[PDB]
């Protein structure tokens, strides 16, 4: 049983938890209510256990995609922001915190993949995927390659596959039609057929993983990479002069990266739901609140329009948000585990020719909708 007249908050150890504690001390100064911030190991696994017995934290911070399953077991309270508050955040971020109609969390930060490029090797980054093969040949003439990124995970290759028509599950009004999957349509086939060609024409190597591509870009061996906010700190140490920009189009259509939204949810068993709404809406989700956390550990792009416009003076964060607005919000439904598994196999079997593109995608679609 959770204690009343108090706030306990769980956030991961790699986020700005000391900044969040500073926002809490301010709350404690205005109300007399104490806020305890903790960052337990494996908290996304521990929460469902302790919350099942009416225990755990009052507020939990995690990416939005774990929240659909918490909500399925009734572990999260429905939230009640008015339209005025809702209008202070980007509209698309609210779509990440709906579970079958209900708002079940507050959107905090937004994360998406971007095209990262070496400004010394590349004056102007390519605007389309179609011109990367010719560009790769030019650079190969000087002993450099055009693009290297993790091909092992579907998270990294999906932007291209989804560009001309692919999608995980059809979304409408806060609900995903779990029998409407877009892995086997013409769009996904066009995109996967472009990727395997890059591999057959030797512009890329099928065994390239995250470590390989990061090392090559950071050593200056390749002109581009595809990665997210988490990678920037290591490139900083490398001293490569880099830019971060919108991903290339394919068949004239924007690449569609998966969008992950750091979210804050309220324990349904919490006796302090009003205090929690007050802390989140009026202390944390303000320029001052978001600033205190970001100064401890950068959040990346944020959901709050007002502060985002100030963060976007950094072109790396502005590109992150631009890519996020063109991307695909990651489905928060349990059926996504089937998607990740099937799509990973499909891409790997097609890149190795162990299977055709049409066959590889046909099998994945079947595996996901069965």
Swiss-Prot record:
It comes from the Bacteria. Keywords: Periplasm, Signal, Sugar transport, Transport. CDD domains: PBP2_MBP (cd13656). InterPro entries: Maltose/Cyclodextrin-bd (IPR006060), SBP (IPR006059), SBP_1_CS (IPR006061). GO terms for molecular function: carbohydrate transmembrane transporter activity; maltose binding. It holds the Pfam family SBP_bac_1. GO terms for cellular component: ATP-binding cassette (ABC) transporter complex; ATP-binding cassette (ABC) transporter complex, substrate-binding subunit-containing; maltose transport complex; membrane; outer membrane-bounded periplasmic space; periplasmic space. Induction: Induced by maltose and the transcriptional regulator MalT. Permanently repressed by cold shock in a PNPase-dependent fashion. It is found in: Periplasm. GO terms for biological process: carbohydrate transport; cell chemotaxis; detection of maltose stimulus; DNA damage response; maltodextrin transmembrane transport; maltose transport. Part of the ABC transporter complex MalEFGK involved in maltose/maltodextrin import. Binds maltose and higher maltodextrins such as maltotriose. Belongs to the bacterial solute-binding protein 1 family. This is Maltose/maltodextrin-binding periplasmic protein. It comes from Escherichia coli (strain K12). The gene is malE.
């Amino acid at each position: 049983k959770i204690e009343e007249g108090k706030l306990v908050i769980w956030i991961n150890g790699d986020k700005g938890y000391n900044g969040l504690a500073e926002v809490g001390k301010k709350f404690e100064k205005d109300t007399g209510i104490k806020v305890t911030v903790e960052h337990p190991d494996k908290l996304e696994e521990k929460f469902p256990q302790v919350a099942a017995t009416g225990d755990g934290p009052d507020i939990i911070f995690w990416a939005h995609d774990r929240f659909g399953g918490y909500a399925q077991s009734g572990l999260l309270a429905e939230i009640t922001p008015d339209k005025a508050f809702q209008d202070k955040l980007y509209p698309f971020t609210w779509d990440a915190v709906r579970y079958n109609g209900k708002l079940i969390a507050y959107p905090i930060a937004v994360e998406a993949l971007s095209l990262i490029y070496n400004k010394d090797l590349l004056p102007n980054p390519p605007k389309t995927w179609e011109e990367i093969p010719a560009l790769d040949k030019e650079l190969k003439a000087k002993g450099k390659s055009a693009l290297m990124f993790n091909l092992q995970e579907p998270y990294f290759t999906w932007p291209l596959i989804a560009a001309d028509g692919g999608y995980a599950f059809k979304y409408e009004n806060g609900k995903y039609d779990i029998k409407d999957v877009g892995v086997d349509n013409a769009g996904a086939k066009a995109g996967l057929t472009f990727l395997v060609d890059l591999i057959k024409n030797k512009h890329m190597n099928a065994d390239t993983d995250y470590s390989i591509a990061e090392a090559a870009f950071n050593k200056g061996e390749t002109a581009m990479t595809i990665n997210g906010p988490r990678a920037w700190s290591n490139i900083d140490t490398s001293k490569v002069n880099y830019g971060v920009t919108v991903l290339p189009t394919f068949k004239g259509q924007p690449s569609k990266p998966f969008v992950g939204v750091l979210s804050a949810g309220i324990n349904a068993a919490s006796p302090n739901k009003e205090l929690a709404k007050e802390f989140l809406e009026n202390y944390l989700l303000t320029d001052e609140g978001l600033e205190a956390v970001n100064k401890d550990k950068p959040l990346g792009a944020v959901a709050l329009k007002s502060y985002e416009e100030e963060l976007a003076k950094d072109p790396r964060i502005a590109a992150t948000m631009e890519n996020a607005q063109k991307g695909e919000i990651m489905p928060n439904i349990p059926q996504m585990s089937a998607f990740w598994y099937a799509v990973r196999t499909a891409v790997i079997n097609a890149a190795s020719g162990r299977q055709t593109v049409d066959e590889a995608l046909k099998d994945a679609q079947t595996r996901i909708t069965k």
